[PDB]
Amino acid sequence: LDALPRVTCPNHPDAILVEDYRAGDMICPECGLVVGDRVIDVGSEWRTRT
């Protein structure tokens, strides 16, 4: 479970994991995908004496 980084699936080792900021979802297109987890989005968090 150390193989996170940015790519894995139970059926295949993921090749791409797009971040959909709009819905705040993580999608893996080539199989179907919801690798789960949206950590609160970095694209939401991209506006942020001696």
Binding site: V18, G24, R38, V39, I40
Partner: protein, 538 residues
């Protein structure tokens, strides 16, 4: 009266107001002086001796309207209207959308709303000239018919003609100006305006920089939407700690390129680049958007009777006069008497006859004009029912309506209440893992608030399970393992094998519980205070 002629002489030559002050025929007066003076209401009546209960008058008002403020001065005959409605108008007048100066083009404020075809008030107070209101109107005098219709105009709303919307009914431009600055981010770290490619930079999540120019800025006139990157810039960070090959074209080029919030759609209006006192290079861009009247959008009469567009219909569906005149607006009659806004009728009655006269009427509350009968008698002269009431034909069956209709022109306000900016919803999205609560709001696509009172109602509701779904499932869901030996939440949990409760040597008697994650945090917070709360079904 000769002094008036001097005031007339001033238009060409000179005769200053100060000279009028120097003339000493008028003086400037504080409240302490007022306590002693015998003030007169009017020059005419008070000079009469026949019924002189007093004649010791010392000073007189220029005009009673001088008590009035900027807002009150706008609405005619406020005294025929209920008093608070005017305060509501005074506030709501401020709430209205409209023009504000001349050089809108040079102006690039964050937000603006301007009307295509504004109109000076058909009925005006003379002072509004000094307010330059006719120069800068903030509404139009629409011709309205007062009728309940289908009840879609009930309670603070109105039915409006969609076909009139087609002609350009209250349509407006919305301008938003965006500004963006470049600047250092450390001794070496800094933002860098550019058009990075997906492989030559990271932090791009998924958005593309097609709209961009090599400078990193979008071109003027470009069609925009609530997702794409509006300004392109990226900041490399460690310059050396990356070292050795984890090179990539993205390198350390972290994205900081500005994009549009997930809501707005439109076209790029203007782009301006310059520098400030800080010295840093910065740019300012104006984005143009178009505001058209829609169902539910907030509107208002000049007489403090606000309302939203309950619906919009084609001109054919609308009931029509002997000519076939469809009103611009359909207001519910009943809203007026409860508020007791007779003045609203006077705008219409004065407006009707003025329109027929082809000449503007004054909107000063105090007159000798006898606006009631004389206007009514005059309304009869143009060839109309003296009270203003008129029969109209059905919009669908064409048949003449049983009741007769009071119809005529009225100054109306488009209020600063974009309903589409007021809406908000979500079913799933970004959260706040620190508390597992939903995001702050719409500008971050957050969830909607739940209040203490909805909880209070929900208890009174007795539907505990819906609250449970709402408090737990619809907000903060969690699973916890506890040691059977102790209600203390202690596990290492090989989330594929072992669980264990260290300090209790638990190897198998692990148990699973469902609680909120934010609640577990509170409990951990108690433990940090050396408290060891525990919990069991027994």
């Amino acid at each position: 009266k000769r002094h008036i002629d001097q005031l007339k002489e001033r238009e060409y030559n000179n005769y200053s107001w100060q000279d009028l002050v120097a003339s000493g025929v008028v003086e400037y007066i504080d409240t302490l002086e007022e306590e002693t003076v015998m003030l007169a209401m009017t020059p005419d009546d008070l000079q009469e001796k026949e019924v002189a209960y007093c004649s010791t008058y010392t000073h007189c008002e220029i005009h009673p309207s001088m008590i009035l403020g900027v807002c009150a001065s706008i609405i005619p005959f406020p005294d025929h209207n209920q008093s608070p409605r005017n305060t509501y108008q005074s506030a709501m007048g401020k709430q209205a959308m409209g023009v504000y100066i001349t050089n809108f083009h040079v102006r690039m404020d964050t937000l603006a709303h301007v009307l295509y075809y504004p109109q000076k008030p058909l009925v005006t107070t003379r002072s509004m000239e000094y307010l330059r209101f006719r120069e800068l109107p903030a509404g139009i005098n629409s011709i309205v018919a007062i009728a309940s219709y289908t009840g879609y105009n009930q309670e603070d709303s109105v039915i409006m003609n969609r076909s009139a919307v087609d002609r350009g009914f209250f349509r407006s431009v919305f301008y938003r100006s965006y500004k963006e600055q470049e600047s250092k981010k450390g001794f070496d770290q800094e933002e860098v305006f550019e058009k990075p490619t997906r492989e030559t930079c990271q932090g791009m999540r998924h958005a593309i920089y097609d709209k961009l120019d090599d400078d990193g800025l979008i071109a003027p006139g470009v069609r925009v939407s609530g997702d794409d990157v509006i300004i392109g810039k990226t900041v490399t960070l460690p310059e050396n700690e990356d070292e050795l090959e984890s090179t990539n074209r993205r390198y350390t080029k972290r994205d900081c390129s500005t994009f549009l919030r997930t809501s707005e759609t439109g076209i790029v209006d203007q782009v301006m680049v310059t520098l400030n006192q800080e010295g840093y290079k910065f740019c300012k861009i104006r984005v143009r958007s178009v505001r058209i009247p829609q169902i539910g959008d907030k509107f208002a009469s000049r007489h403090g009777q606000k309302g939203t567009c309950g619906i919009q219909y084609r001109q054919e569906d609308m009931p029509f006069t002997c000519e076939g005149i469809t009103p611009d607006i359909i207001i519910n009659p009943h809203a007026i008497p409860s508020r007791m806004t007779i003045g609203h009728l006077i705008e219409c009655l004065q407006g009707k006859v003025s329109a027929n006269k082809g000449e503007i009427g004054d909107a000063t509350p105090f007159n000798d004009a006898v606006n009631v009968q004389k206007i009514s008698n005059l309304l009869s002269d143009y060839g109309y029912h003296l009270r203003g009431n008129e029969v109209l034909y059905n919009g669908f069956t064409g048949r003449k309506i049983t009741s007769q209709i009071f119809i005529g022109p009225t100054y109306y306000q488009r209020l600063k209440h974009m309903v589409d900016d007021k809406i908000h919803s979500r079913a799933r999205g970004p959260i706040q893992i620190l508390n597992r609560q939903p995001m702050e709001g719409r500008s971050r696509d957050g969830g909607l608030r739940f209040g203490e009172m909805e909880r209070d109602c929900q208890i009174a509701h007795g539907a505990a399970q819906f609250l449970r779904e709402r408090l737990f499932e619809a907000s903060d869901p969690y699973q916890v393992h506890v040691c059977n030996l102790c209600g203390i939440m202690a596990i290492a949990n090989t989330r594929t094998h072992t669980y264990e409760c260290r300090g209790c040597r638990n190897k198998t008697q692990i148990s699973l519980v469902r609680m909120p994650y934010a609640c577990k945090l509170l409990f951990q917070e108690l433990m940090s205070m050396s408290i060891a709360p525990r919990m069991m079904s027994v």
